[PDB]
Design an enzyme around this catalytic site. Structure first.
Site, short mmCIF file in Angstrom:
data_model
loop_
_atom_site.label_atom_id
_atom_site.label_comp_id
_atom_site.label_asym_id
_atom_site.label_seq_id
_atom_site.Cartn_x
_atom_site.Cartn_y
_atom_site.Cartn_z
N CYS A 1 0.80 -1.22 0.00
CA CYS A 1 0.00 0.00 0.00
C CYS A 1 0.83 1.26 0.00
O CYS A 1 1.57 1.53 0.94
CB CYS A 1 -0.93 0.02 1.26
N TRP B 1 -9.23 6.22 -0.72
CA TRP B 1 -9.56 6.95 -1.93
C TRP B 1 -8.56 6.56 -2.98
O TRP B 1 -7.47 6.07 -2.67
CB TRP B 1 -9.55 8.46 -1.70
N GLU C 1 -4.88 3.74 -10.87
CA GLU C 1 -5.67 2.54 -10.65
C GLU C 1 -6.81 2.48 -11.69
O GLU C 1 -7.02 1.47 -12.37
CB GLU C 1 -6.21 2.50 -9.21
C1 HEM Z 1 -6.23 6.63 1.95
C2 HEM Z 1 -6.09 6.34 0.66
C3 HEM Z 1 -5.37 5.08 0.15
C4 HEM Z 1 -4.63 5.07 -0.95
C5 HEM Z 1 -4.35 6.23 -1.94
C6 HEM Z 1 -4.14 3.72 -1.14
C7 HEM Z 1 -3.35 3.29 -2.17
C8 HEM Z 1 -3.21 1.97 -2.51
C9 HEM Z 1 -2.89 1.44 -3.85
C10 HEM Z 1 -2.66 2.26 -5.16
C11 HEM Z 1 -2.82 0.10 -3.74
C12 HEM Z 1 -2.53 -0.91 -4.86
C13 HEM Z 1 -3.93 -1.42 -5.22
C14 HEM Z 1 -3.92 -2.22 -6.49
O1 HEM Z 1 -3.02 -2.02 -7.35
O2 HEM Z 1 -4.86 -3.04 -6.65
C15 HEM Z 1 -3.06 -0.26 -2.37
C16 HEM Z 1 -3.04 -1.55 -1.90
C17 HEM Z 1 -3.44 -1.95 -0.65
N1 HEM Z 1 -3.86 -1.13 0.38
FE1 HEM Z 1 -4.05 0.95 0.21
N2 HEM Z 1 -4.51 2.96 -0.05
C18 HEM Z 1 -5.35 3.74 0.73
C19 HEM Z 1 -6.00 3.29 1.86
C20 HEM Z 1 -5.94 2.01 2.42
C21 HEM Z 1 -6.64 1.59 3.61
C22 HEM Z 1 -7.62 2.52 4.38
C23 HEM Z 1 -6.29 0.30 3.87
C24 HEM Z 1 -6.73 -0.63 5.01
C25 HEM Z 1 -7.35 -0.17 6.11
C26 HEM Z 1 -5.37 -0.12 2.83
C27 HEM Z 1 -4.74 -1.35 2.68
C28 HEM Z 1 -4.24 -1.88 1.49
C29 HEM Z 1 -3.93 -3.26 1.24
C30 HEM Z 1 -4.08 -4.47 2.21
C31 HEM Z 1 -3.40 -3.30 -0.18
C32 HEM Z 1 -2.98 -4.52 -1.00
C33 HEM Z 1 -4.37 -4.95 -1.52
C34 HEM Z 1 -4.29 -6.24 -2.31
O3 HEM Z 1 -3.39 -7.09 -2.03
O4 HEM Z 1 -5.12 -6.36 -3.24
N3 HEM Z 1 -5.17 0.95 2.00
N4 HEM Z 1 -3.23 0.90 -1.61
C1 LIG Z 2 -4.80 -12.16 -7.14
C2 LIG Z 2 -4.90 -10.95 -6.24
C3 LIG Z 2 -4.17 -10.90 -5.04
C4 LIG Z 2 -4.25 -9.77 -4.20
N1 LIG Z 2 -3.55 -9.73 -3.03
N2 LIG Z 2 -5.07 -8.73 -4.58
C5 LIG Z 2 -5.78 -8.75 -5.75
C6 LIG Z 2 -6.66 -7.56 -6.11
C7 LIG Z 2 -6.27 -6.87 -7.43
C8 LIG Z 2 -4.83 -6.34 -7.43
N3 LIG Z 2 -4.88 -5.10 -8.21
C9 LIG Z 2 -6.22 -4.78 -8.66
C10 LIG Z 2 -7.13 -5.66 -7.79
O1 LIG Z 2 -7.54 -4.98 -6.59
C11 LIG Z 2 -8.30 -3.77 -6.77
C12 LIG Z 2 -8.51 -3.09 -5.42
N4 LIG Z 2 -7.92 -1.76 -5.39
C13 LIG Z 2 -8.53 -0.70 -4.60
C14 LIG Z 2 -7.68 -0.49 -3.34
F1 LIG Z 2 -8.28 -0.93 -2.24
F2 LIG Z 2 -6.56 -1.16 -3.58
C15 LIG Z 2 -7.45 0.96 -3.01
C16 LIG Z 2 -6.93 1.77 -3.99
C17 LIG Z 2 -6.70 3.11 -3.77
C18 LIG Z 2 -6.98 3.66 -2.55
C19 LIG Z 2 -7.50 2.87 -1.55
C20 LIG Z 2 -7.74 1.54 -1.76
CL1 LIG Z 2 -8.44 0.71 -0.34
C21 LIG Z 2 -5.71 -9.87 -6.60
#
Ligand code: HEM
Ligand SMILES: Cc1cc(N)nc(C[C@@H]2CNC[C@@H]2OCCNCC(F)(F)c2ccccc2Cl)c1
Ligand code: HEM
Ligand SMILES: Cc1cc(N)nc(C[C@@H]2CNC[C@@H]2OCCNCC(F)(F)c2ccccc2Cl)c1
Ligand SMILES: C[C@H](O)[C@H](O)[C@H]1CNc2nc(N)[nH]c(=O)c2N1
Ligand SMILES: C[C@H](O)[C@H](O)[C@H]1CNc2nc(N)[nH]c(=O)c2N1
Ligand SMILES: [Zn+2]
Lengths: 411, 409
Positions: B108, B280, B285
Site C-alpha cells: 500500500c 480513496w 488505478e
Molecule cells: C487513503 C487512501 C489510500 C490510498 C491512496 C491507497 C493506495 C493503494 C494502492 C494504489 C494500492 C494498490 C492497489 C492495487 O493495485 O490493486 C493499495 C493496496 C493496498 N492497500 Fe491501500 N490505499 C489507501 C488506503 C488504504 C486503507 C484505508 C487500507 C486498510 C485499512 C489499505 C490497505 C491496502 C492493502 C491491504 C493493499 C494490498 C491490496 C491487495 O493485495 O489487493 N489501503 N493501496
Molecule cells: C490475485 C490478487 C491478489 C491480491 N492480493 N489482490 C488482488 C486484487 C487486485 C490487485 N490489483 C487490482 C485488484 O484490486 C483492486 C482493489 N484496489 C482498490 C484499493 F483498495 F486497492 C485501493 C486503492 C486506492 C486507494 C484505496 C484503496 Cl483501499 C488480486
C-alpha cells in the site's frame, strides 16, 4: 520439483524446472525479500567442481555427454588445475560460455538475441595499449555504421587477483560530467567521479555537455592508462522531434552503442574481470533514464516549459506528457539516422515470446521483474502482467566493485 | 542481520531493524526470488503465543509494557483461551490492530494515512441484513459527499470456521461483466464469474456496461444473500477531458469509493474474515489498470483513434500518448466533481516521506516495490529509485480464497 508462473493478462501458466540447476544465492530468505535491492582468489578445491559442472553442460549442449571427448577433456582440465591451479578454456567453450552468461542474465530484456553474439577472444592481450586496440575493433565491428551487431571482447582471466585486467569505464562510451563551484553539473552527473579520475590521470577535458570520455585501461594489475577512442568510431545521434521543431535546439544528442564494461564474466569457475559487451538500445534507457532521471540530464522541466504544459500542479500530468514526447524524439531520431534501436513495446513483446520458448525448451527463464518492466508505461507492456522467477545460473555476468576503490597503485 | 536500503536518486541510506520481528514466510528462498508472484482453525496452543505477541506490542505502544494492567490482560486472555478456545479483543485493541494491519500492508502506497482510520466495530452483527446495514453506513460515512474518509468495518471473528462472515464481492462497489453472444464482453471482464453467481442467486441484471453489482453477504456461515446498495449512496464520476471535448462521448464513468471487501484481517491470532475497508483512489488505478488493461475495459485503441495518432507502428508511442490523456481525464473529472483523488506523483512523494518517518521512529517499513511503483511513468516517481525490503508483520491483511470455492450450500 515444479514451480509455476502465471500471466494475469492471458491466464497462460508455465512450469519451471530449470531453477533446480540454480546454485548461487539471491539475497532473499523465507523471512525477507530483497528483490528491489540493486546489490543484494579461488582454491583448486572449489574450482574443479565448477569446471566439471560447466563442461558437463557444454558437452550436453553439443550432444556429446559421456563421450570419450567429454571424459578426456574433464581429465585434461583436472590435470591442468592440479598442476597450475587454474585452466584454459577452449575457444568453443569460451563462445558457449559468453552466450550462456547472456542467456542467464535475468535483468536483460533483450535475451531473444542471445545466440547471435560475436565473441572476440582477447586472451592473448598483455598491455593497456593492446586492450585499447581490441576495444576500438569491437566498437567499429559492433557499430557497423548504424546497423548494430551484438559483441563481447574477453580479456585474460583472473589469476592471483593481483594481475587483473579491468576497464575502469562503466561503459565504453559515456559523456563526462563536471561539478561546478556553484554546485550545478555540466554534462552527465552520473560520471562526475570517473571524469575527475580521468582528469587526474591527465585527460584534457573540453568541459562541454557531451564530451566522450577517454578509456582508462588496466592490464595485468598495472596502473591504468588513458586512451581517446577515435572520434570517427563514435557514432552519435542528434535528437530531434517529428512535430516539435524546437526540440533540436535543446541541443541533445546520444551515442548509438551501449557497451557495458565493468562486469565480471564467470565461466566454469574462471573469472574474466574485463569483458566489455554491447548490443543496441531500448529507447527508454535514453529517453526515460539518461534524460529524465533527476540525478542525470534532468530535462523534463525544460521540455514541459517549451510545450507550454500546465506546471503548477503534478496532477496535470505534465511530467508524463513531456516524458512521452522525449521518448518519441529518441526513437524517431535513431530510426531517421538508421541506427538500430528498439521501442519498449517491441522489446517486451519479443521478451515474452523468448521466455515462453525458453520454458518449453529449457524448463525456465530466470527473469528479474523489477528490471525487465520498462521505466515508463509499465502496465501497457506484456511483461508487467507476467509472473517471473528470479534465480542465478552460471555462466553469469556479475557486478564487481569499481577498481579505484580496490586498486593497489604501483606509481 | 541489520539491513541497509539505499535511495539511488538521493543517496539517502536507511537501516532496517524492524524486519527482525517478521513472522510469516515471503515465498522467497536463498535460491529463488518470488517477488513478482501475486499469490506466493487455530488451536489453544497456536493461539496464545499469537495473542501474547500482539498484546505485548499493544502495551508497548501505550507505554505500559510490563505494567500490572499488561500482566493482568495477558492473564485474562490466557484464562479465556483455555476455557473458551478463543478470546475477544477490547475496543482499544481492535482499533490498534486494524490501524496496524494497514501500517503493515507492504503493498500500500497510501500508508502515510494509516493512523487516520475510522474503525466501525460490527462484531455485534448476526445476520446478512445487519451486514448490509453496516455496509451502507460505511459506504455513506467514507464517501462523505466526495470528501472521502478512510474506514474499515469489522464483522465477527472466525470461530470453528463453519460460521464465517464473508462479503463475497471482491470490492463493495464494482461493475458487472457479461459474456455476449457476440463473443465479446460487455462491462468489466474481471467480474464475469461473480456476475453469473449473482444472476444464479436471483439478481435481475440490467445488462449494461456499468451496472453496480449487488452485495452478496454471508453471515454466521449461512448461504449468502443478495442486497443492492442504495443507488444514491454510490457516488460515480463521468469521465471527461479538459481539452478533448470528444472524450465525454466514450460514455466512461467510474465510482468514487475504492473498498476492498475480500481480505482477512488477522489480529492477535484472531481472524476477521469480513472486514471491508476503503480509502480513496490513486488515479492510475482507474486510468491505467481499469481502463487500459487488455483484460479490463481495454479502451486504448478507441482513444488513440479519436486522437488520430499513427497506430501503424508501436514506435510512434501511440499507446503511451493515449495512456497519459486517459489519466489526465480521470484526475480532471474527479477534481472537477470534488471527489478525493490522488495522482501518482503526489502519492509516491508522500510514501517516501512516510518511509523515512517509519524508519526513524519504528526501524523500518515493509514495502513491496513491484506494487508500490505506479503502473505508468515508474522512474519519474521517487519510489522507483528507492530500495525496499518486503517482509510480513502482524496484524495483517491477507488474501483469502473466493468463498464460492469454499462454501457448501
Ligand atoms: C487513503 C487512501 C489510500 C490510498 C491512496 C491507497 C493506495 C493503494 C494502492 C494504489 C494500492 C494498490 C492497489 C492495487 O493495485 O490493486 C493499495 C493496496 C493496498 N492497500 Fe491501500 N490505499 C489507501 C488506503 C488504504 C486503507 C484505508 C487500507 C486498510 C485499512 C489499505 C490497505 C491496502 C492493502 C491491504 C493493499 C494490498 C491490496 C491487495 O493485495 O489487493 N489501503 N493501496
Ligand atoms: C490475485 C490478487 C491478489 C491480491 N492480493 N489482490 C488482488 C486484487 C487486485 C490487485 N490489483 C487490482 C485488484 O484490486 C483492486 C482493489 N484496489 C482498490 C484499493 F483498495 F486497492 C485501493 C486503492 C486506492 C486507494 C484505496 C484503496 Cl483501499 C488480486
Ligand atoms: C541486443 C540488444 C540488447 C538489448 C535491447 C538489451 C536490453 C537490456 C536492457 C534495457 C537492460 C537493462 C539496462 C539498464 O537498466 O541499465 C539490459 C541489462 C543487461 N543486459 Fe541486455 N540487452 C541487449 C544485449 C545484451 C548483451 C549483448 C549482453 C551481454 C552479452 C547483455 C547482458 C545484459 C546484462 C548482464 C544486464 C544487467 C546489467 C546490469 O546489471 O547493469 N545484454 N539489457
Ligand atoms: C549499482 C548497479 C548495479 C548493476 N548491476 N548495474 C548497474 C548499472 C546501471 C543499471 N541501470 C543504469 C546503469 O547501467 C547503464 C547501462 N545500460 C546499458 C546496457 F548495457 F544495459 C544495454 C542496454 C540496452 C542494450 C544493450 C545493453 Cl549492453 C548499477
Ligand atoms: C531500487 C531499484 O531496484 C532500482 O531503482 C532499479 C529499479 N529497476 C531498474 N530497472 C532497470 N532496467 N535498470 C535500473 O537501473 C533499475 N533500477
Ligand atoms: C505479475 C505481477 O506481480 C502483477 O502483474 C502485478 C505487478 N504490480 C502490481 N502493482 C499493483 N499496485 N497492483 C497490481 O495488481 C499489480 N500487479
Ligand atoms: Zn525475493
Amino acid at each position: 520439483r515444479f514451480l509455476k508462473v502465471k500471466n494475469w493478462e492471458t491466464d497462460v501458466v508455465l512450469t519451471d524446472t530449470l531453477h533446480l540447476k540454480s546454485t548461487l544465492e539471491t539475497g532473499c530468505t523465507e523471512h525477507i525479500c530483497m528483490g528491489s535491492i540493486m546489490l543484494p582468489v579461488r582454491t583448486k578445491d572449489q574450482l574443479f567442481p565448477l569446471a566439471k559442472e560447466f563442461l558437463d553442460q557444454y558437452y550436453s549442449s553439443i550432444k556429446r555427454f559421456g563421450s570419450k571427448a567429454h571424459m578426456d577433456r574433464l581429465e585434461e582440465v583436472n590435470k591442468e588445475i592440479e598442476s597450475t591451479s587454474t585452466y584454459q578454456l577452449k575457444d568453443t567453450e569460451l563462445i558457449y560460455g559468453a552466450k550462456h552468461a547472456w542467456r542467464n542474465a535475468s535483468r536483460c530484456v533483450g535475451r531473444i538475441q542471445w545466440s547471435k553474439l560475436q565473441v572476440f577472444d582477447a586472451r592473448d592481450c598483455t598491455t593497456a595499449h593492446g586492450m585499447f586496440n581490441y576495444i576500438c575493433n569491437h566498437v567499429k565491428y559492433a557499430t557497423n555504421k548504424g546497423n548494430l551487431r551484438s559483441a563481447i571482447t574477453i580479456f585474460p582471466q583472473r589469476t592471483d587477483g593481483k594481475h587483473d585486467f579491468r576497464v575502469w569505464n562503466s561503459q565504453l562510451i559515456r559523456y563526462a560530467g563536471y561539478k561546478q563551484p556553484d554546485g550545478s553539473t555540466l554534462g552527465d552527473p552520473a560520471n562526475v567521479q570517473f571524469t575527475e579520475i580521468c582528469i587526474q590521470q591527465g585527460w584534457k577535458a573540453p568541459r562541454g555537455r557531451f564530451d566522450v570520455l577517454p578509456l582508462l585501461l588496466q592490464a595485468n594489475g598495472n596502473d591504468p592508462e588513458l586512451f581517446q577512442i577515435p572520434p570517427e568510431l563514435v557514432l552519435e545521434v542528434p535528437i530531434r522531434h517529428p512535430k516539435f521543431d524546437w526540440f533540436k535546439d535543446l541541443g541533445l544528442k546520444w551515442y548509438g552503442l551501449p557497451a557495458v564494461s565493468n562486469m565480471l564474466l564467470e565461466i566454469g569457475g574462471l573469472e574474466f574481470s574485463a569483458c566489455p559487451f554491447s548490443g543496441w538500445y531500448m529507447g527508454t534507457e535514453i529517453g526515460v533514464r539518461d534524460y529524465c532521471d533527476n540525478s542525470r540530464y534532468n530535462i523534463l522541466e525544460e521540455v514541459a516549459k517549451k510545450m507550454d504544459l500546465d506546471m503548477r500542479k503534478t496532477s496535470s500530468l505534465w511530467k508524463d506528457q513531456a516524458l512521452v514526447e522525449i521518448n518519441i524524439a529518441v526513437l524517431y531520431s535513431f530510426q531517421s539516422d538508421k541506427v538500430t534501436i528498439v521501442d519498449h513495446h517491441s522489446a517486451t513483446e519479443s521478451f515474452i515470446k523468448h521466455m515462453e520458448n525458453e520454458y518449453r525448451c529449457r524448463g525456465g527463464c530466470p527473469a528479474d521483474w523489477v528490471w525487465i518492466v520498462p521505466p515508463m508505461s509499465g502496465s501497457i507492456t506484456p511483461v508487467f502482467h507476467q509472473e517471473m522467477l528470479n534465480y542465478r545460473l552460471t555462466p553469469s555476468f556479475e557486478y564487481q566493485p569499481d577498481p579505484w576503490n580496490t586498486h593497489v597503485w604501483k606509481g
